[PDB]
Design an enzyme around this catalytic site. Structure first.
Site, short mmCIF file in Angstrom:
data_model
loop_
_atom_site.label_atom_id
_atom_site.label_comp_id
_atom_site.label_asym_id
_atom_site.label_seq_id
_atom_site.Cartn_x
_atom_site.Cartn_y
_atom_site.Cartn_z
N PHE A 64 63.01 53.17 -66.30
CA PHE A 64 64.32 53.48 -65.75
C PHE A 64 64.80 52.43 -64.74
CE2 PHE A 64 64.02 58.38 -66.59
CZ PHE A 64 64.02 58.14 -67.95
N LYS A 65 63.94 51.47 -64.42
CA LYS A 65 64.34 50.34 -63.56
C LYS A 65 65.13 50.83 -62.35
CE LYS A 65 63.97 46.73 -67.05
NZ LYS A 65 63.53 47.66 -68.13
N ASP A 68 68.59 52.09 -56.96
CA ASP A 68 69.60 52.70 -56.10
C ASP A 68 69.13 52.70 -54.65
OD1 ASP A 68 71.99 54.81 -57.50
OD2 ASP A 68 71.91 54.48 -55.33
N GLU A 71 67.70 57.45 -50.96
CA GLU A 71 67.94 58.86 -51.18
C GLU A 71 68.16 59.18 -52.67
OE1 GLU A 71 69.22 56.98 -48.73
OE2 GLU A 71 69.22 58.13 -46.87
N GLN A 178 61.78 38.38 -78.05
CA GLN A 178 62.27 37.49 -77.00
C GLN A 178 61.53 36.16 -76.94
OE1 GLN A 178 63.29 39.49 -73.14
NE2 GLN A 178 62.53 41.31 -74.20
N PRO A 182 51.69 37.14 -77.92
CA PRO A 182 50.75 38.18 -77.47
C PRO A 182 49.52 37.61 -76.76
CG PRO A 182 51.51 38.67 -79.69
CD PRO A 182 52.04 37.30 -79.35
O1 LIG Z 1 75.25 50.73 -52.26
C1 LIG Z 1 75.37 51.85 -52.75
C2 LIG Z 1 75.11 53.04 -51.94
N1 LIG Z 1 75.24 54.24 -52.45
N2 LIG Z 1 75.63 54.32 -53.80
C3 LIG Z 1 75.79 55.62 -54.43
O2 LIG Z 1 76.95 56.25 -53.85
C4 LIG Z 1 76.62 57.59 -53.43
C5 LIG Z 1 76.57 57.70 -51.89
O3 LIG Z 1 76.44 59.10 -51.65
P1 LIG Z 1 76.47 59.58 -50.12
O4 LIG Z 1 77.98 59.66 -49.65
O5 LIG Z 1 75.81 61.01 -50.24
O6 LIG Z 1 75.69 58.67 -49.26
C6 LIG Z 1 75.26 57.93 -54.07
O7 LIG Z 1 75.46 58.44 -55.39
C7 LIG Z 1 74.59 56.55 -54.13
O8 LIG Z 1 73.63 56.50 -55.19
C8 LIG Z 1 75.89 53.22 -54.53
O9 LIG Z 1 76.27 53.29 -55.66
N3 LIG Z 1 75.76 51.98 -54.01
O1 LIG Z 2 62.02 41.81 -68.23
C1 LIG Z 2 62.05 42.75 -69.01
C2 LIG Z 2 62.40 42.56 -70.41
N1 LIG Z 2 62.43 43.58 -71.24
N2 LIG Z 2 62.14 44.83 -70.71
C3 LIG Z 2 62.14 45.99 -71.59
O2 LIG Z 2 61.01 45.87 -72.47
C4 LIG Z 2 61.44 46.05 -73.84
C5 LIG Z 2 61.47 44.73 -74.61
O3 LIG Z 2 61.65 45.13 -75.97
P1 LIG Z 2 61.59 44.01 -77.14
O4 LIG Z 2 60.08 43.79 -77.54
O5 LIG Z 2 62.39 44.71 -78.31
O6 LIG Z 2 62.22 42.76 -76.66
C6 LIG Z 2 62.84 46.69 -73.76
O7 LIG Z 2 62.71 48.10 -73.58
C7 LIG Z 2 63.40 46.05 -72.48
O8 LIG Z 2 64.40 46.90 -71.91
C8 LIG Z 2 61.80 45.00 -69.42
O9 LIG Z 2 61.49 46.10 -69.03
N3 LIG Z 2 61.75 43.97 -68.56
#
Ligand SMILES: O=c1cnn([C@@H]2O[C@H](COP(=O)(O)O)[C@@H](O)[C@H]2O)c(=O)[nH]1
Ligand SMILES: O=c1cnn([C@@H]2O[C@H](COP(=O)(O)O)[C@@H](O)[C@H]2O)c(=O)[nH]1
Lengths: 219, 218
Positions: A64-65, A68, A71, A178, A182
């Site tokens: 999910f990388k 944010d 919080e 990419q 291996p």
């Molecule tokens: O740099 C930022 C800071 N906050 N948020 C998002 O904006 C909302 C801020 O909510 P808050 O008013 O409860 O702090 C949250 O969803 C947070 O993930 C961002 O997108 N970028």
């Molecule tokens: O730096 C990277 C590059 N790729 N991915 C993830 O790893 C998988 C690479 O799949 P592929 O073998 O089809 O390129 C994908 O899910 C891609 O989002 C990462 O997490 N980090």
């Protein structure tokens, strides 16, 4: 560290439940660790994790990388672990507080964080590459044990391995589609992540078996 | 994008009933809701369609897309299929990753919001030093919508300078994180507000109060 069968992690980025299940089932004899990301989760729901657990003997890394504020990161990690993910990936570039938020939830919940250092795509050169050594060092200082680094840049993967030490766990995407190799990648990474080379193959099982045959002396 | 009252609700409650109730309570004050992973990962992507059915509000999917181009394309496609009008995208992963999102948005009639500098303390470590360059990259790529930090109005002002007055700029960090609504609206077109509204004893009164405080700016 997690014991990854055949040092091979499937990146299951098909977006249809039926296809994702079929392909994963076909390679299950070769792989006990599956990475599920947003392409599949946003298409089929978080219950896809439950389904995979039910159908296969596979650990699940939720890719999910997380990127944010602290919080929101906490909430994302809680929802993800509640659904049954063994581990979650986390970006380092948003800074130490954002990473710590994820580590705290993972600790409380008995799960793992993987810290993403340098990414494998060309755009990673613009900003991430120049921060990556420091991101890795930050991870070490924070007590991060699991890391992701790029197959496509062996020199960078080697340096990142040095920074995190031999005891840390390192997985590496960018193998196959990419351009990463291996065997060369496994000089530094504990496991390789492979997506398209397997899941788009006419015979995903044969594709996986072929990759494994090519690294058999490294197992 | 025309945001009612220059106010975007950050709906980060993680229970469907509560999220729908609280949004309903403040509906007269807004027409734009930001939905992120806390709600979507708890209740599913179908929640987006449910918001459109109940409120007709615009939906910004705050997913901070931050993958490689090929994965970014898939994330955007799934997100827009669910009915999101817009998606947020990190700039740190580089130009190719942003372009991947722009492509899908163009294809589906949606908008990309480029996140330049974040509002939390950790943003100082890596993001802040890259943020002006990320904004210039957005300009080079033809990005029209941006996100910048309420908690650093001098940085928000600089980002406005880079992108110009024609670009659309929204700003989180108002209230809970310390940013001021009125000061933020000196530079941003709209403020994002989450906890100050959704954790308030009376969310409607909280929203009304914020709007009262910026009434001269509406
Ligand atoms: O740099 C930022 C800071 N906050 N948020 C998002 O904006 C909302 C801020 O909510 P808050 O008013 O409860 O702090 C949250 O969803 C947070 O993930 C961002 O997108 N970028
Ligand atoms: O730096 C990277 C590059 N790729 N991915 C993830 O790893 C998988 C690479 O799949 P592929 O073998 O089809 O390129 C994908 O899910 C891609 O989002 C990462 O997490 N980090």
């Amino acid at each position: 560290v997690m014991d990854v069968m055949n040092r091979l992690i499937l990146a299951m980025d098909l977006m249809n439940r039926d296809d994702a299940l079929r392909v994963t089932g076909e390679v299950r004899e070769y792989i006990d660790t599956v990475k599920i990301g947003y392409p599949l989760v946003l298409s089929e729901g978080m219950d896809i994790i439950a389904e995979f657990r039910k159908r296969f003997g596979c650990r699940i890394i939720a890719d999910f990388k997380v990127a944010d504020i602290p919080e929101t990161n906490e909430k994302i990690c809680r929802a993800t672990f509640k659904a049954g993910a063994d581990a979650i990936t986390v970006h380092g570039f948003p800074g130490a507080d954002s990473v710590r938020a994820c580590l705290n939830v993972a600790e409380e919940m008995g799960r793992e964080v993987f810290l993403l250092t340098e990414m494998s795509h060309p755009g990673a050169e613009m900003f991430i590459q120049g921060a990556a050594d420091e991101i890795a060092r930050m991870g070490v200082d924070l007590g991060v044990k699991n890391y992701v680094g790029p197959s496509t840049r062996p020199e960078r993967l080697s340096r990142l391995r040095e920074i995190i030490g031999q005891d840390s766990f390192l997985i590496s995407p960018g193998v196959g589609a990419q351009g990463g190799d291996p065997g060369e990648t496994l000089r530094f990474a504990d496991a390789i992540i492979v997506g398209r080379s397997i899941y788009l193959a006419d015979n995903p099982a044969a594709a996986a078996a072929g990759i494994i045959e090519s690294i058999k002396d490294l197992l």
